[PDB]
Amino acid sequence: AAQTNAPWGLARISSTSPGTSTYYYDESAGQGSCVYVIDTGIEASHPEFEGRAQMVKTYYYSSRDGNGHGTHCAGTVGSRTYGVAKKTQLFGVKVLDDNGSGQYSTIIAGMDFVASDKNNRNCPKGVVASLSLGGGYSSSVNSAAARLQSSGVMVAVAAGNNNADARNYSPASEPSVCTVGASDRYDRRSSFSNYGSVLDIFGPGTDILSTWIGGSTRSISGTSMATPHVAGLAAYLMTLGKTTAASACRYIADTANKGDLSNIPFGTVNLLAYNNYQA
Ligand SMILES: [Ca+2]
Ligand SMILES: [Ca+2]
Numbered sequence: 001a002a003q004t005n006a007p008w009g010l011a012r013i014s015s016t017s018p019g020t021s022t023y024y025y026d027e028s029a030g031q032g033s034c035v036y037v038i039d040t041g042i043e044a045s046h047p048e049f050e051g052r053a054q055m056v057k058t059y060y061y062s063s064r065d066g067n068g069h070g071t072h073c074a075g076t077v078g079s080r081t082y083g084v085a086k087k088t089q090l091f092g093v094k095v096l097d098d099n100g101s102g103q104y105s106t107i108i109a110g111m112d113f114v115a116s117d118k119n120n121r122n123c124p125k126g127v128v129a130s131l132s133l134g135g136g137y138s139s140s141v142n143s144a145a146a147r148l149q150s151s152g153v154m155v156a157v158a159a160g161n162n163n164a165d166a167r168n169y170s171p172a173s174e175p176s177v178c179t180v181g182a183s184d185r186y187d188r189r190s191s192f193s194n195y196g197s198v199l200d201i202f203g204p205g206t207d208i209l210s211t212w213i214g215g216s217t218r219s220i221s222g223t224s225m226a227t228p229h230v231a232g233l234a235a236y237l238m239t240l241g242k243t244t245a246a247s248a249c250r251y252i253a254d255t256a257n258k259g260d261l262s263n264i265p266f267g268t269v270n271l272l273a274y275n276n277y278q279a
Helices: 008-013 069-078 104-120 139-150 223-239 248-254
Strands: 033-039 053-058 089-094 126-131 154-158 178-183 201-204 208-212 216-220
Touching (some): 008 201, 033 069, 053 104, 069 089, 069 223, 089 104, 104 126, 126 223, 154 223, 178 223, 178 248, 223 248
Parallel strands (some): 033 089, 154 178
């Protein structure tokens, strides 16, 4: 299948070179996989989700996304127009308040929640969790992210937006999960993206169009936008039988576009998420 005039990052992920505008993907489109978006929530009524999204848990007064950040990320995973995995199932877990902020004990609780809740849901092709959040190093946060991964969920986390080594941020610094850096439309590392040996992969994160609250859309930037391209891609590959939750990050790295990016510091992987689609 082909989506013409796609957002650039969806094109980038199905091409060996930059500058194309068509997203080429298999029709299966992540059908039968599930992605948990652990964030500010998801506006599930947005037309672009087509009834495929729902809130399953909130740690605040309401389950509503009063911010937009979670809706945007969810959109890049699995919205019709803006998503990598256009037929996946989205579940929203609200660990961040409507200012985009959250305590570490709540974030941890949210990851433990997903590990359990997945056993109650029908996800025959597998389970993915997208965590477009982070702060300073915490061994407990890293530990929760490790638990979620070892549960059998493909965990994808943002590297962070400090133009620094990701080793000092969590859950970015947990080795066992899939730590995602950001690139721009010219195949440069995004000027804000963290880097370092703990990064596993890069994805598109500068000027990413996606769904917003109030039924709208908008284009924002960050490692937060790169993470759901990778989470979506994982879902899409698992539905294809190409990989499993335990090895998806490694599979994505082994099948990535190698060496295309510029401004990658020495010791950081130069690998950009790629679907390898061939009609
Ligand atoms: Ca190339
Ligand atoms: Ca890793």
